[PDB]
């Protein structure tokens, strides 16, 4: 049943906190929740912002009752691109997603560069396949109100949340073709 | 008037030094109007805690069953108070109208 | 060694002595600092009235010890 | 007393819960309500989401005493556009409300595909009639900060609250304009 | 589904909040609750008083999904003497504990000359069906560790939640054994 | 109306919040409380203690709109026996309650001698007076349970909620019959 | 003395509950408050809302035993711009504020009205003398997410909150600088 | 004075095995500090629950009394050999000024 | 390291919220939390009762980042009473704590009947091995204001979250001590 | 500062809430404490118990602010008896109080052999100097009215409290008295 | 037969007038099913309250014990409530198929 | 065995009216083994509540005492109730091997 | 094996021990880093006062365990 | 006139002025009393900074308010 694998989703729990934005899940999610507790959890967000929102999503999840639901979760990570979350905690090797943490590291420690030095409008073809297809649209959308750094911060949030085990040579690939002297100060071999 | 036998209760307490000598062993006998669980109750608080310290339970038992005052004037001239008794009575025909 | 002489209007007076002092010592120093006859004064610790003839070494009162004051 | 209809409100209370956000009320509301306690059903949807509000607005509405209240309540529905719920509460039928339930559920099960295919700037002003008029700009800000799909999110959650007996109707008619990619997903009779 | 039952159940909220401490129940149900939500209740008693907690175990009791569970609600109404509110609701008729709120009003008014003029444990003995069992040691508790007087007040507060449709004609004659000052004021006729 | 006068009773405050317990008062209020706040008062007292519930009983008095809760609350505090609070509040004169602070104030500062010295079932009589009935049934009945010392500390928590403007000159006197060694340190004159 | 003006405050605590918002205030309080009361206050408001943290922040004010804290309270009035309660309370005379009440009832069962024809973002500029400058951020930026008339709301929530003597005076001016069709209604 | 009484009464709690031998009923007539209403209270102690069960009580209520250790040293000459009176007697005189 | 011993600990914080009270614990974790942390902790057990307060605890305790916490959360259990959870946190293995599972299930739907046929007041004394010392205070204190039933009661929600393996055992001979009349309900 | 006190007092705040019963204190501490919050710590200690009254007087022990009251504390603790408990805090060193701990095992450990057997009037009056007065006053009375039986297992639960370094060699002289039966139990 | 016990202090209770003459002190040797601590509670209770207030405590710590009402019976009878035993004697068997 | 006294009470207590013959005022010199509490205690609480009410309490101020069983054997026959001591007599030897 | 020693002060300094090393042994240590004398210091672990004859083998304290100090004052 | 004057380290010195002093002489005075350069002082009136120039009257300072001094550190 739901119990013995409980337990190991509550060990990874760093994992899903860091990586998960509730909000892209939970139109999936709907057969398993109480219609209040999607409300909440979408009120977190709003709030706290998606971790905090994340870290509520994943004590209602682990309540969950009614059998179905492990897959039920795991099939909307897998629907909303998440793949590579799913591919983690399928196979309950994280190894793939840890390797992220050094450059995860990085870029926060050079994120004031970044939102000098990119444009995002250039590099978000690129990253595509790095973002969860929602958040593209919410950062081109800043870039076009809030302007060039505004955006370039928002692609950091995100950035960080992805689960690609390869986005930080994605980026860099990126970052060599259409190049922003920030180009030189992300190394990834 | 049970409102003017109430309020007879109040001087007792004001004056409760003046019911000293009164022996509640001897008493109940008298006041026929305490039940077979008020005497019961208050003859045992009367073997552990002493007569004098009993008394203010005595009043206070007898106050909550109807015409006390009447049946306490005549109890304390039972027991040769009459001096008491006659307090008592001055009083309660006294907050009567 | 201190201790504090608070009255019961609430102010409070810190007063310089020794465990040897008596309580007439102790009366002597409360007229120096709010000039209020001895005679007048009567001092309250442990909601003990301490008695002139005896000394704080007595009461136990100690460094920052609490005397309440009262007419 | 006021209790005969007061008790009659609470057998209804789950309908009133999944239709009403007390917000769109609580401008009439005003005089019969203390002033803080409106100033907590405010919080209470900026914290655990609308319906959570309406659990709330429901508690004091029963508190109130003094009388014209549950006309004003209902004069309150009426004025706000929540007419229908209106209709219902007079009339002690829910019977349209509940035949509603089919297609809220229906819509909550193609959540993600609606997101995707569908750009609410086209069909917000056909739906106008079926969603409360602050819920229309609620959403069209929510699209020009956050993007199309963050939008029909919310145009979603805003027609599941839908008092309005055709809305589903409506929204395929709305979507039979413009050749959609959700349209044959939604299917009225 | 269960959802026919438990709109049935709102409709009477008012009648269970106001004859019912969940805690003599709870020891039935704890089957069909999660452990926390059950010292919740416990709580909201502790601080709010029988009544709050009453309303939150209504609030839990319609979460319930997993059947059996209207039945083991009434079969713990009944095992836990609170009969008569279970004849009420498998009845769906009030009307017996309608008839009472006469004479929990009556109570009310009468309460101050009740704690002067009646000693409980004289009158507990024969109240002793018309009391929750546990109210029973509850109140004699109170008396021997407040006084008779604090024990008669929470006599009057356990009476005015009694369900048991003659608990007033009950009264009055455990009141006709003894002479009272109290019996005059207190009239069922 | 209610409004001009609420005010003064909001600034003496501090004074219903030291004499009053609200127990005593709320068998007679029942008319103007919900159900609901009565208890709540009283979890609040057996929870935190008199004055607390003291504090949110004046926080619920001051919210009432049904007008005649004024003279409702004089009413109560008239038959209570708080009479001279009563006094006080019908005059809105308290210079006769503001005497008794110098003396509270002291009973509080030898408070440690009365709990050794006292027995209170010798003065209790001629303090009952200057007590709510209730209050001595309570006094006398820790005495029994548990023991001369913790009754005498009772005594003085109920000595510092009294109203009654010549307490400390009843207690005096009551000193002066059966003199127990504190009768030396309570001074009047 | 420190106990005349708690009683002298506490029986106008009606005035400071309707106008006051303690999170706007708590800055210019540093020296009096714990960490624990003011995120204590600081939760009231995010939970129950304004009113039910000033009622709080009250509580907190009498129960501080330091010295200079009655003055402590009314110095932060005024630089935190509650100015009109702090020109009341230092005077305890009320008169000023009490003018108010019959627009901020007017208002009240207006509100529907003003919630559609406001645009909020129009007039904010020209009555910002009535409100606590922090409240107008919050105002543009519910505007900004929600839409005109969440944050046209927003603004009445504020207005009634204002103590200044001539809000409704200043707010007429402003409604018929942008010709606005809620101006008339809104009499003077 | 009554410093010096405080101190007394500790000292008996100390030591109490050597008091075991008073007899309540014997030593209470030498002892008139001891209320009306205290007397009353402690037969009825010593008739229901024995002697030596009284004595905690004894000194217990003597000590609330002023003058008490006074009195008490004269009960213990009236009521015995003298041996406690002595002891009794040389503590309190310790205290004194 | 730091790291791995929070997801351990993290796995089995279903045992920890069924088992801990942090308000008995937190006196022996002195070192290691703010007093607002305390006071939150406290909060929740007064509100939402013991389970909730545990619950917090984690929170709290994962949300330290300081040196040593591990190890003081776990000396704090051995020394709080609540060894046997202290055992089985430190070995990784709580197979003994679950075996337990089959009594907390039967004593749940015993209640009623437990409720009613024991005196607290008999059996704490035998049992108190099982127990918290500091639970057994509130029982008796309980039963002492509210009857032995309300007691009784309170017996039942401390026995649950009792984490000694024997405790069902050592309740069955205080049960056979003291004839019950609830005895053979329970069957070991 | 006065920190210096208030830091070191809880580090040590498990001794204080195991030996203390604020009650017994709470006279002497009335002028330093408000009126209310005395109230709560005597709420606390009719609900919860000793223990849970302690761990709050202490609470609110650590927020006193005028001068003078660490050592009112102490003056409290010495002059209601507790001296030993506030020998231990004045000089910072709880080793006496540690030392009994072997002892209160004990003692909890031979509870019902104790409690069946001895009967508290026979040897209370002699260990008058292991408990606080006021204690005995208690416990005598538990015997009256709650019967002996209860009364013994109060007189435990005092004993274990007790902060007096000799209480264990007192009380083996005191049962030393008469033909026991339990005496051979305890041994020093 | 521990089904038809509850049944029968039911009975008890419904009718408790009935057993006002049961006296708890002459009784309670002629229960052999209560425990020590019972023995040392009730015989508390029964100072400090009296007998028939004691009684309601009496009755509801022996329904607790297992087989009471066989112990119940020749109890009453051993007290020469004979006429009072048969009544619970009957009511008892009552409840048995 | 000292366990096998504690069992001889427990007979006592399981078959009570057998001892009701009993005199406490007679019994008492011939137990050595009660102390001057003990005896004290009883001798107050037999002249208060009267002698078959006291029993119960001479029996169980016995049994608290070490090696009771074999006084209460000689004390009993010491009575001339010879015929009940035999009684005792085979039930205390009976858990011993 | 390390142990870690918290001040009141809220600093807190990690020392090098076994579990062999006694108390005054560790009391030492504290004086060689932060340069208070042994006489002043008073530890705690878990709330047990520990004793200045034991060694921390005998009190259960462990690899990475807290000791808390307090100052004489 | 009375003014209180609130260092960080949270013990509160309160010194003697009128209106008509200037800020400069707030310093002074707390130089007098404290010992403390008046270069190194900041004070804070509800979280306005004083000027040394002007005076208590200008601020609208008054009886029994409150000034908080920050050091230079």
Redesign the interface.
Known sequence: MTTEQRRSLQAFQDYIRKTLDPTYILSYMAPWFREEEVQYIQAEKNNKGPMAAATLFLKFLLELQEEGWFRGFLDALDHAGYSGLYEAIESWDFKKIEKLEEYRLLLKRLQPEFKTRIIPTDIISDLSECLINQECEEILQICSTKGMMAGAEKLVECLLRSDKENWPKTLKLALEKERNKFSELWIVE | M?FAEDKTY?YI??N??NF?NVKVVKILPYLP?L???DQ??????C???????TL?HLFNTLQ???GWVEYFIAALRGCKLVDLADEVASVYQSYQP | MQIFVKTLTGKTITLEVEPSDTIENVKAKIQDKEGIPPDQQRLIFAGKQLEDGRTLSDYNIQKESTLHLVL
Chains 1, 4, 5, 6 share one sequence.
């Not at chain 2, 019961?40 to 608080?45: K, N, P, W």
């Not at chain 2, 073997?47 to 310290?53: A, I, M």
Request: aromatic fraction near 8%.
């Open positions: 049970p109040k307490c004001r409760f030094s000293c109007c039940t077979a669980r019961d109750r208050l003859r045992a608080t073997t552990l805690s002493g007569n004098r310290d203010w909550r069953r109807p």
